[PDB]
């Protein structure tokens, strides 16, 4: 297998400014016929992939000349001149030199905006749910930018691991922010065992991490 290494994994863009995405292959992509089998695809929110560039530098019919592909051997670049807001989405390189056809891991392009700290909320499990033997505790991080954030659960000061899952919205069309939920799942017995439930939030928009918490039963 030829492995494709795409960088960076994410990129925030200011409209009008350039953007560059690179793709490295673990073997050379130059064919016998002198053609180099490197392709670039764009995948917009909710859409299927679309061909942008074929064989390193050739634009597919209809693709804006703002997209320029370059490179040779194992080192390739897709450069977007004068980024527009409609350019957000995922970009993938792909090789067809040999089977299996392989893709890069993708690059997520979002819209740059000013840093916005999350508003943090914590929700205890409902009495309804507790009646059924399970407790879900939910932490909400609302309307923040950039996407990078850390959320950790502490129960009576003990760091939890392996018992939470996170989910994140797409960048908002109106304010360009994200929101994120983290849900901690415990048995009722485990929930009843401890007193203080806290979710600790680290984000560059906050001077110090923010902790929200409640006391069970109160």
């Amino acid at each position: 297998d030829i492995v494709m290494t795409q960088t960076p994994l994410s990129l925030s863009v200011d409209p009008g400014q350039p953007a560059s995405i690179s793709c490295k292959s673990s073997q050379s992509l130059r064919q016998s016929n002198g053609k180099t089998s490197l392709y670039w695809y764009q995948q917009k929110p909710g859409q299927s992939p679309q061909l942008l560039i074929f064989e390193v530098s050739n634009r597919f019919s209809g693709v804006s000349d703002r997209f320029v592909g370059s490179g040779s051997g194992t080192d390739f670049t897709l450069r977007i001149s004068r980024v527009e807001a409609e350019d957000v989405g995922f970009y993938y390189c792909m090789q067809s030199k040999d089977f299996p056809l392989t893709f890069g891991g993708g690059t997520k392009v979002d819209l740059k905006r000013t840093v916005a700290a999350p508003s943090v909320f914590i929700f205890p499990p409902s009495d309804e749910q507790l009646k059924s033997g399970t407790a879900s505790v939910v932490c909400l991080l609302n309307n923040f930018y950039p996407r990078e954030a850390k959320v950790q659960w502490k129960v009576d000061n003990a760091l939890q691991s392996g018992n939470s899952q996170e989910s994140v919205t797409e960048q908002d069309s109106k304010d360009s922010t994200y929101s994120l939920s983290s849900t901690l799942t415990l048995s009722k017995a485990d929930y009843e065992k401890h007193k203080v439930y806290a979710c600790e939030v680290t984000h560059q928009g906050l001077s110090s991490p923010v902790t929200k918490s409640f006391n069970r039963g109160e």
Partner: protein
């Protein structure tokens, strides 16, 4: 306009077989090698299969070799993927795609990158059976705060399969609402939450009802969310 349309996707148990179809428009189908490429939820693109124009030469990824069979009906402008011995790991949106240039035999078949893709069809492989969600309030709890913005919501837990739809106040309230992508739990059941930010002063003078619908279970729930 050159077009591909997939169908045949569904929710199936491990070990079963599905046959996907890909119907083609506005080009000589039998002059083009074709591909299947999949995309698991939240993940990137993974090539699955390729078939020569004449159907006499096929290639598979190592992940599906010995389980999948790619075929094509050159009479009817249509491409197929038979998926046997299905595994949970096969869960993905499957898309067919057309090689970007014509290529027929003239000592080997030639393959290059694809240009046009279909919208795809989803195959979900799971041992789970149909199950309706439980809907629990995410309440502003407890009472004492310093005012300003409050958040409330609904936790829509333990359903199968996707999707559920959620709205607030029958679609009348969209401002401040965020409905999160579902997550698949280790139990094999899905769970999601939908939240909304509202002024704390409104919690007992306004009404906030989350409307949850899960068609597979014929579940329709309207849960009023109130402070505890």
């Amino acid at each position: 306009r050159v077009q591909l349309v997939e169908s045949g996707g569904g929710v199936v148990q491990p070990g079963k077989s599905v046959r996907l179809s890909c119907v083609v428009s506005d080009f000589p189908f039998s002059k083009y090698p074709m591909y299947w490429v999949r995309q698991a939820p939240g993940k990137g693109l993974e090539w699955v299969a390729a078939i020569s124009a004449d159907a006499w030469h096929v290639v598979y990824s190592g992940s599906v070799q010995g389980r999948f069979l790619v075929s094509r009906d050159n009479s009817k402008n249509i491409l197929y993927l038979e998926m046997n011995t299905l595994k949970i790991e096969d869960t993905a949106v499957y898309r067919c795609a057309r090689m970007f240039q014509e290529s027929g035999p003239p000592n080997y078949y030639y393959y290059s990158g694809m240009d046009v893709w279909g919208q795809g069809t989803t195959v979900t492989v799971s041992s789970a059976s149909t199950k309706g969600p439980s809907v629990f309030p995410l309440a502003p709890s407890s009472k004492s705060t310093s005012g300003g913005t409050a958040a409330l919501g609904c936790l829509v837990k333990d359903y199968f399969p996707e999707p559920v739809t959620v709205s607030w106040n029958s679609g009348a309230l969209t401002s401040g609402v965020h409905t999160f992508p579902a997550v698949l739990q280790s139990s094999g059941l899905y769970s999601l939450s939908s939240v909304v930010t509202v002024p704390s002063s409104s919690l007992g003078t306004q009404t906030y009802i989350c409307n949850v619908n899960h068609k597979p279970s014929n579940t329709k729930v309207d849960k009023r969310v109130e402070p505890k």
